[PDB]
Structure formats: structure tokens, C-alpha cells
Amino acid sequence: GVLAHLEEERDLKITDVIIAFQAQCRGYLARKAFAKRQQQLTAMKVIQR
């Protein structure tokens, strides 16, 4: 058994890899991409007038 558990652990501590990174990726993406749905709105109001 022995050596194989240490390998197990070392995969287990890396099998998620990595929510905290993806959350930063996400974080970044929303506050940029939103600019579109931000943009189109008052434009729709011009169209109405």
C-alpha cells in the first residue's frame, strides 16, 4: 500500500484545481462583459422616441 496513498493525496489536493482561480476569471469577465447589456438599454429608449 504505502507509497500509493501519498500519490492519492497529491492527486486529491490537485483534483479540484482551482475554484479560486475560476472565480477570479469569472469576476473579471462579468464586470467587462456587462458593458453590452449596459449599452443597449437607453438606446432602446431613443428608438421609442
Partner: protein
């Protein structure tokens, strides 16, 4: 928060609305938290949301005085992931140790592990940061998501 920035925080929430009806959903909540200054784990959000499924996640509404305790509860937030953790986090698949990984594995791992991404979420994030061999160096990709 100060009524100074809280005024601004309110505005960005109001600019998230769809109609005017004052009600940003349990969905969009995550983007409002982001856009104010956060990068929550989708879990951090789910925590203060009160654990809904897709149905009432889409159906339940929020208003700002339902949101501001949420944004406040996270913000003074536990542990914020440094450059050093993150590089080792991506370093995981460097078959030897090189500092470099192929942009195909990297496009994929983010579409299979942790808070899984779509191709859309990945391509915009990663593209143009592979080199002339199709390796993305991770070290700069990590810095890129930091100062962004």
C-alpha cells in the same frame, strides 16, 4: 460601507435591471457582487442566496436591501488567493515542471474542474496567451486574471 461608495454600489445594481421593476434575480446577483468589486466563489454567493435550485434561482427576485447584507457579508472576506497559490494551481499539469502547458489542456481543465467554464468563458480568457508552439505559459495568465 460609506454612503459615498454605497451610492455607487446602488447604481450598478440598478443598471443590472431588466425592466425597471427593481428586481434583480438570484441569478444576476453573482454579477452584481462581481461588478461592485468582488470575485465570489459561486459557492460564496449560494451561501447567502439560501441554497436554491435552477427553478427558484431563476424565479426568486432580489432588491438592493436584500442584496447589500449579502455583498457586505462576503466583502470583508476570508482569504484572497495570491499569485503564488494560483500559478502552482495551474502548474499541476506541467508534465515535467517547465513553466508551460499546451493551450488545449488549459482550455479543457477550466471546462472540466472546479467552478467549470464554458468555451466562451475560456477562449476570451485564454486566447492570444499561447505562444508560437501552442503553449500557454501559465505564470502570466495568472497575473492577467489578477490585474484585471
Amino acid at each position: 460601507f460609506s454612503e459615498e461608495q454605497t451610492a455607487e454600489f446602488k447604481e450598478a445594481f440598478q443598471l443590472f435591471d431588466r425592466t425597471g421593476d427593481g428586481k434583480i434575480l438570484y441569478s444576476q446577483c453573482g454579477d452584481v457582487m462581481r461588478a461592485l468589486g468582488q470575485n465570489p466563489t459561486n459557492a460564496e454567493v449560494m451561501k447567502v442566496l439560501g441554497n436554491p435550485k435552477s427553478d427558484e434561482m431563476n424565479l426568486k427576485t432580489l432588491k438592493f436591501e436584500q442584496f447589500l447584507p449579502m455583498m457586505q457579508t462576503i466583502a470583508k472576506n476570508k482569504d484572497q488567493g495570491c499569485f503564488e497559490d494560483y500559478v502552482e494551481g495551474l502548474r499541476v499539469f506541467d508534465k515535467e515542471g517547465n513553466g508551460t502547458v499546451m493551450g488545449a489542456e488549459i482550455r479543457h481543465v477550466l471546462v472540466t474542474l472546479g467552478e467549470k467554464m464554458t468555451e466562451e468563458e475560456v477562449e476570451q480568457l485564454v486566447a492570444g496567451h499561447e505562444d508560437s508552439n501552442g503553449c500557454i505559459n501559465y505564470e502570466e495568465l495568472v497575473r492577467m486574471v489578477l490585474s484585471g
